[PDB]
Design a protein around this ligand. Sequence first.
Ligand SMILES: CCc1cc(C[C@H](NC(C)=O)C(=O)NCCCCC(=O)N[C@@H](CCSC)C(=O)O)ccc1N(C(=O)C(=O)O)c1ccccc1C(=O)O
Length: 282
Amino acid sequence: EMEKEFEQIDKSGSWAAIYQDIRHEASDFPCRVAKLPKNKNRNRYRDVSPFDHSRIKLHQEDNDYINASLIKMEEAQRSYILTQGPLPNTCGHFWEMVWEQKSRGVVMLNRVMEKGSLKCAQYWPQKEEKEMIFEDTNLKLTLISEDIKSYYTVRQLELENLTTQETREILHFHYTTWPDFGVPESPASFLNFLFKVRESGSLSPEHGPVVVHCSAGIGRSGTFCLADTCLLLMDKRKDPSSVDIKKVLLEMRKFRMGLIQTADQLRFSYLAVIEGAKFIMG
Ligand SMILES: CCc1cc(C[C@H](NC(C)=O)C(=O)NCCCCC(=O)N[C@@H](CCSC)C(=O)O)ccc1N(C(=O)C(=O)O)c1ccccc1C(=O)O
């Protein structure tokens, strides 16, 4: 019972302690491609890189690098691509990946500007009549529609491969209410957001893996993927109380570093899964 476990950590206020045990037990793999000089400008943070073993490769002979990792959850039979918030110069790479990986959805858990500074580039068109064109990767992006809601917005975008003239519909699931500091009051809205994404079919096998990102693409994006997988696991196995989130988080960290950056985020994941269980259970 993770909830019982939850109350014990809270009781003895040992979340920071536990979070640290995870950091120490977390995997450590090479990130040689990421650190090459030629890729300096393709990374937003010096300390956040994709392990080579699980990095996403752009289908181009020039430079195939993009700071993004493929998180494969074998048992849950669910895959996610976690990536940093595109930079002014990597937006075309970002959409090239989406096209190449055949992703159906894009999950954004942050705002272009937070705490008075840029946390991500404006990589999608804001107005229908103002489409964007990424010359380097020869892609055209068009805002088709947008549904603004209280805690999040869903956008319908059309991505076209100018080379082939082929087009695809892409769903942009953007969570707009994540606090500047800390984590959400209650997981309620976050969980509904997650369900909306599931409902769209973006997380389903008939599509490439979903692309999730925040700023570094590890903290909040971690929270999102960890909760989804956990809820899914409880949905598969016979003993839903046999799902150990710390174990699942470590499994994910074999694919990308620092998923879940703080004790607050870790605590929040518990709330999300726990609160989410009383519902997804039936
Ligand atoms: C925009 C916020 C943010 C920045 C960075 C980059 C950062 N800084 C630099 C370059 O100044 C950073 O915090 N780096 C610390 C290291 C992160 C990687 C990690 O855990 N590495 C391992 C080492 C590698 S693996 C074995 C480690 O234990 O240190 C990483 C994560 C986050 N970040 C994120 O959620 C995110 O965007 O991923 C947050 C972190 C803490 C609290 C809140 C948030 C939030 O978004 O609300």
